[PDB]
Amino acid sequence: GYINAAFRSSRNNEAYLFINDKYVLLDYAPGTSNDKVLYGPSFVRDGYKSLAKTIFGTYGIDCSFDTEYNEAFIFYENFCARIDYAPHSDKDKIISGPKKIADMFPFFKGTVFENGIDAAFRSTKGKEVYLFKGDKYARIDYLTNRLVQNKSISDTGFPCLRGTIFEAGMDSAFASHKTNEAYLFKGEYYARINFTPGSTNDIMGGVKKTLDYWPSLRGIIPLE
Amino acid sequence: GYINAAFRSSRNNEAYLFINDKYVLLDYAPGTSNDKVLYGPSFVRDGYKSLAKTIFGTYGIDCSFDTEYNEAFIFYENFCARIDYAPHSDKDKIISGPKKIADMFPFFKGTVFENGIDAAFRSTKGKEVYLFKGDKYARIDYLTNRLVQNKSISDTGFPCLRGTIFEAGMDSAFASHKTNEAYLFKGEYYARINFTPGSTNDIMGGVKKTLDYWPSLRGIIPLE
């Protein structure tokens, strides 16, 4: 039971992390630690009124990514929804869905992404998102609803992950409030990366143990 | 666009039929051809407002059975919920779920029923129910949450069904308010059967074309 999904809040330096059927709201304070739990751990169904009687409320959220304003796509197995997460209030609502992935994103039909997605993060470019499944990644535009390029190997688009535990897949991710940086998680490990839409990038600090650098998560992960 | 799910109402001679993402409430006037549409066709989304923001609202119901009082279990693929259908009123609500079938009914783990069920009808005996998947059927008690006997081929428990289209599966079923009768559906066909819990068992006037004997369904099946 490690971090299964995450997205960047519209609130500065804040991020929602999903673990099993629970979530935490974190001030992740980039470049220090110093990170601090703001809310949770609590059941998704308790913190998100609009998700209470849904599969997301029962089983939690296994992938997500922020889009714009106070909205985010959330996933569980082959299903997804777009929600308004109304940060710091009880006014969350389902905007679109819930739908199967294939009905929300027709271009994933007959692909490995059809039955579920491992992780995703929001790009700094237009309305683009990177999504990950097994050792593959996709790059999409969620507004025009299109695949920007062929699905390919994670290391083809992210050469800096060659030779690390992340080359074979990742469990969760979110974009930082710092431009062109992102966090990737897998088991007890994380990495902070600098990406640039195009190619040639780097890992800032290498693969670190998560609890060594996110002290706020000590009594939380791994969740029994 | 055929009947996918159905259950018997607590109100005398009324049944709910599910087709695609819609439903109809029928006075099905048994042993007779004076059935009549009490309500619908309507979207499940619209008739049951407790389901509007769930997978059941988006995709409809593919299996169902009444339990007792004003309750019924509903299914869509590997998911199910127990609902109060609060007949001839608003105020329908979810009681339990949505949950995976294997979480609601743990004895189905590792069986063909784990990922979905074709059809079901409530027994006259105790809190027993007959559920169908492919050419197999199960007998359960939903109150005690117990598989009552081994999973058997459908023709092992309903020999009368041998040599008919039903021997290989049912799309949909519900129990009649008439004691020990049930209706079975598949394609443009249906049968009415007299069953006897724990014994054998017969067919009432053979397989008939549905539209011939259920005129109130004229504009409704096949739905687009």
Ligand SMILES: [Ca+2]
């Ligand atoms: Ca995940």
Ligand SMILES: [Ca+2]
């Ligand atoms: Ca069915």
Ligand SMILES: [Cl-]
């Ligand atoms: Cl998944």
Ligand SMILES: [Cl-]
């Ligand atoms: Cl792609």
Ligand SMILES: [Cl-]
């Ligand atoms: Cl749902």
Ligand code: NA
């Ligand atoms: Na998923």
